[PDB]
Amino acid sequence: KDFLPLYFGWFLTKKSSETLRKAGQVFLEELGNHKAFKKELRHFISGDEPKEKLELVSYFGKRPPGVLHCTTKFCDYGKAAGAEEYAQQEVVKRSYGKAFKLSISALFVTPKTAGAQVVLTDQELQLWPSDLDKPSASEGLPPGSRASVTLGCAADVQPVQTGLDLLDILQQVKQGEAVGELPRGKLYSLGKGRWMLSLTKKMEVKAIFTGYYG
Numbered sequence: 001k002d003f004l005p006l007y008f009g010w011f012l013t014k015k016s017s018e019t020l021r022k023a024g025q026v027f028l029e030e031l032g033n034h035k036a037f038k039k040e041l042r043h044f045i046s047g048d049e050p051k052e053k054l055e056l057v058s059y060f061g062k063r064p065p066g067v068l069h070c071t072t073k074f075c076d077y078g079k080a081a082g083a084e085e086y087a088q089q090e091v092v093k094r095s096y097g098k099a100f101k102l103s104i105s106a107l108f109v110t111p112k113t114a115g116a117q118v119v120l121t122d123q124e125l126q127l128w129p130s131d132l133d134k135p136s137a138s139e140g141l142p143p144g145s146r147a148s149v150t151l152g153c154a155a156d157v158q159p160v161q162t163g164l165d166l167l168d169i170l171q172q173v174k175q176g177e178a179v180g181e182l183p184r185g186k187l188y189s190l191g192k193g194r195w196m197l198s199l200t201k202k203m204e205v206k207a208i209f210t211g212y213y214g
């Protein structure tokens, strides 16, 4: 009669998390100042905003307060569908507490979330859930495409939206030239307020697989 974690995932170390967090911040500051982005503001925000400049760091005001993480399976202590099934797996139990490296291939921004795209290894993909209830946007994409790290959310958006935004982006990119060059890579405008920075060099972040309890 033991209950599960709120969710399973890879939790970044202090050092790796700050490295990614900082890169995310720089991206928001650079994107917000980029002429291509400014030009499309009316596709990013939809209201009485002045033509003046939008600071994305402020826009994505809801940020993780501490270390960052890549969620694998949200369990809600066993109440989520597929939770018990996921937790019972040998590979989950065996991997519990193990160290991993996550490959970050891109940073992205939408009107709802700012995040980082994670490219899971085959070993890490074994820890990705295979549920009966799937996000419709995951269909047609490689397993684990949803893998991401939440860097920030718009005021009325929940962190879960980040992975869903990535799936939408990946559905979209499944490409035209980049519309800009930032120091860390090429900048793509995917439309509908969506932006992806494709990192010239993938970031590697160290993380531990474990379970979070609220």
Ligand SMILES: Nc1ncnc2c1ncn2[C@@H]1O[C@H](CO)[C@H]2OP(=O)(O)O[C@H]21
Pocket: 006, 007, 070, 071, 073, 074, 149, 150, 158, 159, 160, 161, 162, 163
């Ligand atoms: N229904 C869900 N499916 C997948 N991930 C979820 C779900 N609900 C919440 N999360 C994620 O679990 C964490 C606790 O809220 C948090 O980390 P995240 O991956 O940034 O989005 C959230």
Ligand SMILES: [Cl-]
Pocket: 156, 157
């Ligand atoms: Cl919303």
